[PDB]
């Protein structure tokens, strides 16, 4: 009824954090009897224990805004915070030319 | 410290080993009523200067 040991041993076998290890709540009596990495490997086999994929951050809005920005959008004077020099240094332009 | 001389390790090792209760058969053998060993110490409130 205290499963701190199995949670720590499972994240070691699966190489993830303890925050993305999930037990099937049925079969909890099975998990309680496991004390070694070998008995934990059996449960990962019979699918009693699993790991979640990491959640990302969707880049669909980022990729659309960048697509619009190569068309000339979102880039007028109301959108600029740094000076012209900080945005495109005058020395970088001189050297290229 | 994780980097200690063998001489400090040995004196620390002895304070750990002698930090014990009176055995219960000793309490029956020597007919004692004081049962606490008052030379014990605990790491949170001690100042072993060793």
């Amino acid at each position: 009824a205290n499963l701190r040991l199995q949670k720590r041993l499972a994240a070691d076998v699966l190489k993830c954090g303890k925050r993305r290890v999930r037990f099937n709540p049925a079969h909890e009596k099975y998990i309680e009897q496991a004390s070694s990495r070998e008995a934990i490997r059996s449960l990962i086999e019979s699918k009693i224990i699993a790991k979640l994929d990491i959640k990302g951050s969707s880049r669909g809005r980022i990729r659309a805004r960048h697509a619009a920005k190569r068309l000339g959008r979102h880039s007028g004077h109301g959108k600029r915070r740094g000076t012209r020099e900080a945005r495109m240094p005058s020395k970088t332009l001189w050297i290229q030319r | 410290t994780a980097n200690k001389t063998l001489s400090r390790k040995l004196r620390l090792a002895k304070k750990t080993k002698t930090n014990k209760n009176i055995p219960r058969w000793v309490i029956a053998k020597d007919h004692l009523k004081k049962t606490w060993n008052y030379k014990r110490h605990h790491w949170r409130r001690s100042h072993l200067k060793l």
Partner: protein
């Protein structure tokens, strides 16, 4: 900030264990004991503290050799052994 905050800057050992007297009194930077005086050849003893004198002196330890010599003199055979030799 000369009080509680200043005490949080302490992570040093001024004194360590003495090889002669065993106490937490050996100055690690001056290499001298503030209790027994080591590495001096004589022991540090002061008459302005007789309480410090009684804490570590003859008798506060085992007296292992001196005990045996006295009992041999008082009631054993040692006073006879001198007469054979001193003749």
């Amino acid at each position: 900030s000369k009080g509680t905050a200043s005490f949080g800057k302490r992570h040093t050992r001024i004194h360590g264990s003495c090889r002669r007297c065993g106490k937490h009194s050996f100055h690690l930077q001056k290499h001298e004991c503030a209790s027994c005086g080591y590495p001096s050849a004589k022991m540090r003893r002061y008459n302005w503290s007789y309480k410090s004198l009684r804490r570590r002196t003859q008798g506060t330890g085992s007296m292992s050799h001196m005990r045996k010599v006295y009992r041999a003199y008082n009631s054993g055979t040692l006073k006879a052994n001198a007469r054979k030799y001193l003749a």
